[PDB]
Design a protein around this nucleic acid. Structure first.
Lengths: 208, 212
RNA sequence: AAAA
């Protein structure tokens, strides 16, 4: 099971593409936040979506309409929704008002729940970026000086095997293997040569 | 001095509004990052922004272009720019590609720099909302056991006086008054009502949602 | 939907 958590603009096909591409199930949660009042273009898009859910075996969407007066009051309503959603939360920030998308994104990040976010080229095509809760945790984690010395050696060597890495770092092979396991769980390196990935390069840039 | 860090679409209007709202000075840094190659509509928006800036003692913009291949490669480009920026950073996420704005927002957050974000109604309305690095700090702060007790009692009472709070938490009035002064300044507490009850403010009500 |  899955949740979808989006805000609707005037174009339901962004969401239909998301539901189709991530194999939406009838039993998933589909929650759509809209501003108050719901304007004519948004109502048409939601009603068009509703006219497809039976044919496509999708859940009926649950619409939340929210007044936006300031950041914190609106974030409270978004957080209330988020904290009830089954995980993972699937989000696609390509659709709907930027104010609400900003709330959704900050909300899912500070909630610490599991999520995947997509952001695409609005005008279509192939450009797309994506990230998840593990991406954000890795970038926001506090790294010890010993961890940073490990990562910085990997940055300099562009990859080293465990045996040679242990000798270079003056670490037990047993204790280095445990740290490598702890760090790959954050998704910042790969492996019997250990190597940084792109996310690990960003970690190094933040802790320089 | 402060810095402005935005992207740009086909319209300079929202950025000019932000510069007015946030008291832009000619010595501020204005940095604009755009997708490569710079398309015609964006070039026209930048040229129109420059002409308007020259009237108004605003900071002249420095332009960066980036390729967007994937999240981490593009974030590295954004981080490189961010680390050149004097603090605090001001951004408005209502202009330009959503992909770039998402990277700007995530970049300034994980850079741990001081920043303020504005984002506005883009479809005809007038509402603008705002948050800053202290917003994120307050929501993700590791509150102590004693701090959590205080925050939860305030939530459960919907606000109460210092004297009552000190009894419920088994503390002296003096030490509680000092903690409450600290968290008012930090920005999560207020003393509403005519009876001087202490309560969570709008930000504190979000903090408590993430902390029991 | 680079101003839902």
């Amino acid at each position: 099971m899955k949740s979808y958590f989006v805000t609707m603009g005037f174009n339901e096909t962004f969401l239909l593409r998301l539901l189709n591409e991530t194999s939406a199930q009838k039993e998933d949660s589909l929650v759509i936040v809209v501003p108050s009042p719901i304007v004519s273009g948004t109502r048409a898009a939601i009603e068009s979506l509703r006219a497809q859910i039976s044919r496509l075996n999708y859940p009926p969407p649950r619409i939340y309409e929210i007044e936006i007066t300031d950041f914190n009051l609106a974030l409270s309503k978004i957080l209330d929704i988020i904290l009830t959603l089954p995980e993972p939360i699937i989000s696609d920030l390509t659709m709907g008002m930027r104010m609400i998308n900003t709330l959704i994104l900050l909300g899912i990040i500070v909630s610490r729940k599991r999520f995947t976010v997509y952001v695409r080229d609005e005008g279509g095509g192939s450009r797309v970026i994506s990230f998840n809760d593990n991406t954000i945790r890795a970038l926001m984690r506090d790294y010890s000086r010993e961890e940073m010395k490990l990562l910085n050696v990997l940055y300099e060597t562009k990859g080293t095997g465990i045996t040679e890495l242990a000798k270079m770092l003056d670490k037990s092979e047993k204790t280095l293997i445990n740290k490598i396991a702890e760090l790959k769980k954050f998704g910042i390196l790969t492996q019997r040569k250990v190597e940084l990935n792109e996310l690990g390069l960003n970690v190094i840039k933040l802790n320089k």
